[PDB]
Amino acid sequence: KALVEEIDKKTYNPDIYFTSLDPQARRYTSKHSFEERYTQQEILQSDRRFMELNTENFSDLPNVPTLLSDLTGYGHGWVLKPETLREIQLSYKSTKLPKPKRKNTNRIVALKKVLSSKRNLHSFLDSALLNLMDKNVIYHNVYNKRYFKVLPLITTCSICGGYDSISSCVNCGNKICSVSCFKLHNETRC
Amino acid sequence: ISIDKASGKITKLGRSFARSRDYDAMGADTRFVQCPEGELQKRKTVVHTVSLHEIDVINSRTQGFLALFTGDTGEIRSEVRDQINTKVAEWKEE
Amino acid sequence: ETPPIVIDNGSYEIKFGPSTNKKPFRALNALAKDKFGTSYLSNHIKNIKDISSITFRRPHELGQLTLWELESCIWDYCLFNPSEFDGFDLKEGKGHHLVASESCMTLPELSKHADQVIFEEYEFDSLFKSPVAVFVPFTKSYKGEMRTISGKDESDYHDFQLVIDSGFNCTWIIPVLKGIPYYKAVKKLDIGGRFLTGLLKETLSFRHYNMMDETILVNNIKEQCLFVSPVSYFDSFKTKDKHALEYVLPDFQTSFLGYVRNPRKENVPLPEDAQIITLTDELFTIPETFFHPEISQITKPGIVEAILESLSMLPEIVRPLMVGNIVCTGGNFNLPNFAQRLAAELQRQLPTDWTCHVSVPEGDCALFGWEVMSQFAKTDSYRKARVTREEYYEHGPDWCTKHRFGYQNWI
Amino acid sequence: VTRTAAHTHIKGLGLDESGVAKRVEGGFVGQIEAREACGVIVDLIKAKKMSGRAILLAGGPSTGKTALALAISQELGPKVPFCPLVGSELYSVEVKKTETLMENFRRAIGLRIKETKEVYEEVTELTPEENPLGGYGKTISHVIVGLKSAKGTKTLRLDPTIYESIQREKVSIGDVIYIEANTGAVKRVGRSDAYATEFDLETEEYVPLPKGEVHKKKEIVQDVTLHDLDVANARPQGGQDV
């Protein structure tokens, strides 16, 4: 540097340097697992968005409450329609052998009560056909314990797919590269 | 700031402008400087012209600007010129 | 009657038909309905010309179907029909040898509903319900085709094997220990076929006009264009200009499907009246979320973390052999170079002592697993694995899914 | 983008086993006797069987002495050393010219040395911790240091000197090193790409993640003359103080 230059012991902290042209007239602030990185509201929002991603169209678009209740513990009213079920007795008219080969037992009745049971996984949770721990060893038997990242993150461009000349927005904090994308970022993303 | 990634010496060009009117009362005083014009980031293939004197004095001593200015290079040796010959040949080839 | 019959159950469709035959019987286990009130059958949507709006009322829920009044009727419509499904026939089931390889990942009560509907409505005699993942290692028994791929550089069935099945509703991973699965590590990747359809349609909503109503359009473009990156992310985008397609939309009234003109090919100078959506910067978003699901803004770490956890759960007595015996099955692994990329990234993760052996069939791996099980049932192993006719009534059927034919039997 | 200066039109003497020359070959035309003699001399040279041979040629300007010299230099290949310098360069300033002539003789003789070396390389984890066994304050002599690399991770502890080398490199947990075990010191590849992107800017290079297995091993072959060794030994190479 400029040796023995002008300095009056004004700050000169190597990790503190705050200046501006005074449009706000303020100063600096003072006074590998995702489960230990961020809180739960945003991960819940991401899970809700992913469960919407499960929904394919108008058939499952309003099915989000059922999926949420499953996870947290004429379009969707079950596959029972007479235009589907009661008609199928003639849809196999090519050839079939539909015959009664069965005695009369409670299994035979369960063939029909469970047939159009109007029963879901939610009802399974609300029913005693399976015990309490079965749903736990169905749910918890899948999720991991602590391994959440062992290779780094990518942070791709939100709208385009650029890799260089990247930059974030002032207050939205969303990844982007092209300043052209900023024109719609400050309108629909920020 | 004409910053360079492999330099560590950030060069400040002075002052600059925003596109805001700031507050309501009388103000906006003391603002007449050059405002940034180019893009936020763009590659610059900067061209520098140097002679074999600078390269050789860099090879001879860890610091070379002192001998380039004062003028006390000190009769650099031949294998330096040979390795510079090879390096320049392959740089032209590359 | 010696020859058995094999059914490859699933969460979007099943592969039924006799074990003697080696050609598929794809029963698309998914109903739907159009935008004009009524509802279609399971496998008649493709022939219609209404691609403006789509409604998908399939029997399968998020994970699995939970009703049987029509889907069992659909199984009758597919299995019990010998005209369209020539040669193959399940007349009644009295002496029929069926292996309905259910998604045993279902609840034991679901297993018992399936067992009752096949032991009473179908009135079956022979049965050994294990996942096709149990029967995959039968390749060595007979002349079997498989590409031996290593990621180090760029009974009569096989004993040790760890399997990864892929599908539409869900994709699961399980270590099958010594031929019996270890269902205490039933792993699932949260993404699936419908998840992929939604991801593509939402990504292209920001790129073009709406595909939410025209989701079959997204399905077709995914079938025709999407693939797994050969090496990595950045190396695939750096030259997106040379591979940036232009999907020419179908003539919505007369044309069965749309198409794409290729910048690499000048063979099609024919334009279309319908506008052309320029597919430029959206290809590489999808294939990486299989490996790096954080692109899909989810809490799922990745397949690498799941597989390393699964192997670390297993002891050294099998775990080096278990990596030495890895097969990925299901339709989604027909996506090119998934196995090679996975093997390379694992060999990066795996230390210098565990040799890599990953096997993936060339093509739809669900059909490959189905035919491998067909060859399995051509042999006598199932014939000592089946249950006799006197093994259902005198004792509660639930016992079968508790000690013999239930996922709790292999937890 | 080419420059030919009275040469680059010559590539060899153009001879055979039987001492037969070619009238137009290798940029040389004529001089049957000179080409035969040069071929015999270079054949004697290639055997490495002798030392101190000498010869005088009587040749006027433009007769082709420099051309013959360049051709003979190219006969032995780039690896065989050569140092043809002007006769007026002997009269130096800082060293007596007979000493310079000895230095040139030292330079001319060649050699080919080799060495096999191993090296380890980001850092997976880190666990630092011997006893004084007496009146000493403590005894730190082992620290487990991670070694990520790409194809497998093999953490390992060594002499503490490697630990102080780790502090000398000032590498963080997500920082890649290149530690040749022959000395126990550190050669810095740079920072890493995995624990990177902690900030939008970084003057320090992110540096590509090291490729291959961590326990790297290799061998190097270098052809170095003796005068370089002499001048290297003459001056100090390290030091920390003034």
Place this chain on the structure above:
Amino acid sequence: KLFKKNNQVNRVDLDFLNLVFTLNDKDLTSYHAEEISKLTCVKNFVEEVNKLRETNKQLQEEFGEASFLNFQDANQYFKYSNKQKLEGTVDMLNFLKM
């Protein structure tokens, strides 16, 4: 920054080959060096090398018929362990030699 990149590519360690002798006399005495040189020649590190070579060769002679095979590390119940121990002892022995 445009020059110093071929350092590790073709560097032969002169200090590791003991050619920095002019800078080694600051803390060197003759009798200590001669005593160490006399008590240097093998006789301390080749013995365990031979000990491990014995077990490696006896396992490789007969049990090494399909020991190190990766297919044996894939289709077997003990040959995977044979491969593991063979590679382990090979790495131990060549590390000890180096």
